[PDB]
Design a protein around this nucleic acid. Sequence first.
RNA 1: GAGACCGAUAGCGCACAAGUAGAGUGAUCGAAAGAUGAAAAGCACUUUGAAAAGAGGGUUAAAUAGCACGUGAAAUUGUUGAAAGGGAAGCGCUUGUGACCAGACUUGCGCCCGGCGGAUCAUCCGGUGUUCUCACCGGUGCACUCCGCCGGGCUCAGGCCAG
RNA 2: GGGACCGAGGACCGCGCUCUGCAAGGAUGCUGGCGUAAUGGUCACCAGCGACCCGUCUUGAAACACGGACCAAGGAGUCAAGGUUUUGCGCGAGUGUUUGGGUGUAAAACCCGCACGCGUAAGGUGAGAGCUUCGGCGCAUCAUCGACC
RNA 3: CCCACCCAUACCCCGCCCUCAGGGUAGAAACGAUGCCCUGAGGAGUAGGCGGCCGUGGAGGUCAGUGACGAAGCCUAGGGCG
Lengths: 169, 52, 127, 129, 149, 139
Amino acid sequence: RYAATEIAPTKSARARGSYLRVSFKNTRETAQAINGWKLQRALTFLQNVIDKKEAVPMRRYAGSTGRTAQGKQWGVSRARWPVKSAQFLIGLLKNAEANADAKGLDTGNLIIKHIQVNQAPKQRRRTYRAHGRINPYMSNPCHIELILTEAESHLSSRQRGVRIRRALT
Amino acid sequence: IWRKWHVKINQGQKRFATASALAASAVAPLLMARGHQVSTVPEVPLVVDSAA
Amino acid sequence: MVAAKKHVPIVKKRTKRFMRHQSDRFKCLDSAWRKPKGIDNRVRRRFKGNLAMPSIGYGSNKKTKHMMPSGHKAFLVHNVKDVELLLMHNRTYAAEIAHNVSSRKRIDIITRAKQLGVKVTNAKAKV
Amino acid sequence: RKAPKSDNVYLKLLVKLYRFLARRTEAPFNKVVLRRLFMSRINRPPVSLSRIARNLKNGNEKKTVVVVATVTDDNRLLQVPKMEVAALRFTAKARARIEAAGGRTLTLDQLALEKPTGANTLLLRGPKN
Amino acid sequence: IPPKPRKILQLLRLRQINNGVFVKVTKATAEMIKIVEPWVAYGYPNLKSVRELIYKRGYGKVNGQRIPLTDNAIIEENLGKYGIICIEDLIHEIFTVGPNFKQAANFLWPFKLSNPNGGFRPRKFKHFIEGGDLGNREEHINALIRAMN
Amino acid sequence: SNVSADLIWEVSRNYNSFLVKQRTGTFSRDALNLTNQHSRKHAGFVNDKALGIVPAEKGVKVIAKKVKAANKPASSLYTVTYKSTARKAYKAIASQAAKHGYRADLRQAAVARASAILRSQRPVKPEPPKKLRGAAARR
RNA sequence: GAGACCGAUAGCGCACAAGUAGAGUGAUCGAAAGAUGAAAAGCACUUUGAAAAGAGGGUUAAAUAGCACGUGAAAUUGUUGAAAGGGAAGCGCUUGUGACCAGACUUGCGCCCGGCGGAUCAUCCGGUGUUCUCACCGGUGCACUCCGCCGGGCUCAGGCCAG
RNA sequence: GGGACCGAGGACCGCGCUCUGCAAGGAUGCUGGCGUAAUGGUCACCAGCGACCCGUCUUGAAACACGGACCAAGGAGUCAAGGUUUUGCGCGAGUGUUUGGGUGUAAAACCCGCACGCGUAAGGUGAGAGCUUCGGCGCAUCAUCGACC
RNA sequence: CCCACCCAUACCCCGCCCUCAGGGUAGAAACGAUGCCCUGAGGAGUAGGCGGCCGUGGAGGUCAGUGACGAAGCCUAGGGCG
């Protein structure tokens, strides 16, 4: 059961992924950069993030993050290059593009109507710390889901008297 | 387990309560007030033949 | 008959509920009213600009107590035999079918209540 | 007190009967009897047959004995005079000895029917100490 | 308030503010009012002030209850043995101070006057002879009673 | 004797099998209760003389206690069914309840119960269609 | 064999491969952890992907029951919808705007003219019951009387805000 | 003469008077629009005014100090023995079946032998509730006078 | 020194709630008499005292109570009562 239930699956194409071992915060900002975009422009953008040609704007999870000139396209200053998040979002976009091909939709008019990154159950790892403590090194995996959609009187008597007089004259 | 589960009641109290319960059984309004369907039977102190 | 008995106008002295102190800030505090017991509590001492404490002066009129704005009184009903209890209180009482009554049993309740003239407050539930 | 502390249904009927009599009749006897019905048991001490036999020793014979309490029996009284006693309760020995002497025993509702003003009634209490 | 003026206000039935009573002038009652001068204003009323107070704000003590004087009957049930049978006899008794003044004044509930129309004065806790309101005024209490009625 | 109408009321005032109560009022399920209110006046099972009106197939069925047969429940009720004009049913019920001093205080309630039963046996009128109302419900 | 006991943080530490796993040199210390469905019928086949998995399709009454499985709260998080924000927010009284709603009303009673369909109309006579003077039943009643329905007219009472 | 706020009760009874009824123990009469979100209500936001953050502890009071990241579930005057006060109940100069025995539809209910526990083996005057045949009778109990162990 | 004006939960009048106090209510056409009707006064409150109502698990009785066209639980910028 997907989050966007207003979109019927017959005219749409969907693809999801669970327990993905990527950072949730980097994937949230990457999915926000491509939300509501065309399918071919989003695939080109994500590859440019891998090749460090375009940058993903960091808006919520951007604490003490460096500045770059490639954020000027987005109107921000803090922008990064989440390569791992771009790799996972490409494979999910290629999967939904294949789902539209099998169903018979047109891939040239597909937009990303819905895309959501939810938090997955946390994994656990431990390392060694002095003063008798053990450092927890939990990972933060994420759930991703996306859907592709083809782009396309009670008047009074006095009020009614004025209505008639204006109509006559 | 030593919680005083049983209650000591005077034998005179018990015989008073049993006598009051027998008197209320002869009262036909009190039988209907309990929830008994007493409308098709006569002589609400019902006595049947022992031979029967 | 649908129209209720003639009654004095219904006046609510206060429609707003009484909120517990600091239930807005803490989620562990339910909004149900609890009387503060601290001696320095501003709600207990009735300082101005603070939450009001309920009292018997807010009590509704005895002639219009427990009356819905139509003018009747609610009576919870589980079956047909409960509707027949409201036979003589057409002008003063209304029937409210319980939430656990099934769909077949409800249709018998409304049909009987229309015969008896008794208003049903939730007649369109399972229709 | 407006309501008696007792749960006795027959005492509730007696309170209702003597509320009507104390309201509609100007006799102060009915107000005293109603007040004593409301009191508790330690405030309604027993009255023995020997104590009321003291009070009929003078010219108080042929007068109804009224006690808002239960009337006990005294083994120290050898002979019991003929007397008409009305009380809330009687013991088995007290009721038998009054009826053996030729007297009669009344309840308080029989007293109300017979003497609603409390005419010619000798009213008594028991020892408080 | 000191303890001695507190007791006099209770004995004069002035338990509340803007509360008024009729007092027969003797030497015993005059020294009572002299002590509570920092709290009271008093004077000699005329026939009009007695009439408006009885007719408009006149209430009676009947079995410990405050009954308005809307009938001549309830005056006769309460003061008829003293010879007072109607309102005019009650007004005559207060104004022309008769022998039954004590019974007639005590029968009257203490008068619950309103606040005066037009205010008291710029500052009302001085004596009347220094531009205040407290104390004794001869007939200017009638101007005060007219505003408080 | 030990039992009377006043004593039965004291036992059954607080709890009764016919007793139903919830917040707004306290009702009664007794067949001998008319107006279905819990009180000494309308407690049919408590009182020695009582009346009760139940519906019939066409008309009313009025039952009354017989004081001599109080201990014989199979013959304790004097049952009359009035299947006639409503005016003759009311007249006979009023005569039944007020001419001989058999609960003259219950005469008005008995006539009012017969009217309410016969007002329930008339054919029922069809309900007008519910009007959709407001911008949200109509659209 | 039972219980006015407890019901998976409860009841024995242990409802489970529990004195187990694990800790200590050792004596000893000592957990957490129940539930798909009636039945595995626990996704045939197709398609994308290296795979994990996803989408169609299928099983079932229910995939809103996918062995991360009954129901599935709150803290906390994401997306969409609406809004607010010149150095705190939150709260009380009172209007306004916008969004969304519960009622109430829909006609009833009586009277008078017509037209239909029927005689449970008044009285009297027989049985039955009862409150012993009131009713029911059967007959008589045969049509200016009684009861329903329809078509007109009139009165009274009907909701909200106002003069 | 000009305004403002309110209409409380629900057959008659009363107090009165300007009289074919009245303004005299609480509002009726006539009329208009609408009959639905129109009044009304609930949220969200703006605006005017109001408004310290809770608890604990100390003290005459503050101030200081301590606890408070958030949520769910759990969480603290109970039971027994022995005293004692009051209320209800039963029997009452007595009261208590349940140590045990006898039945039983079997831990219930019903019945009871001998002991045993605790208790038990006379008024006047001032009065005084109440009664009265209106002459007097007078509860309990207080002041005192009493009588006895 | 004079005149007018502004306002506190203070005073005055009216309505409603609750408490207290004083009355009425049976040859019963009579009553949740633990009710109803009439009249007046009063209303802050720590420690403490008294009373009445609400809610949870289990037991006896009762509603010939509800329920697979759906019990319990849960969510609810939907209502009603107190």
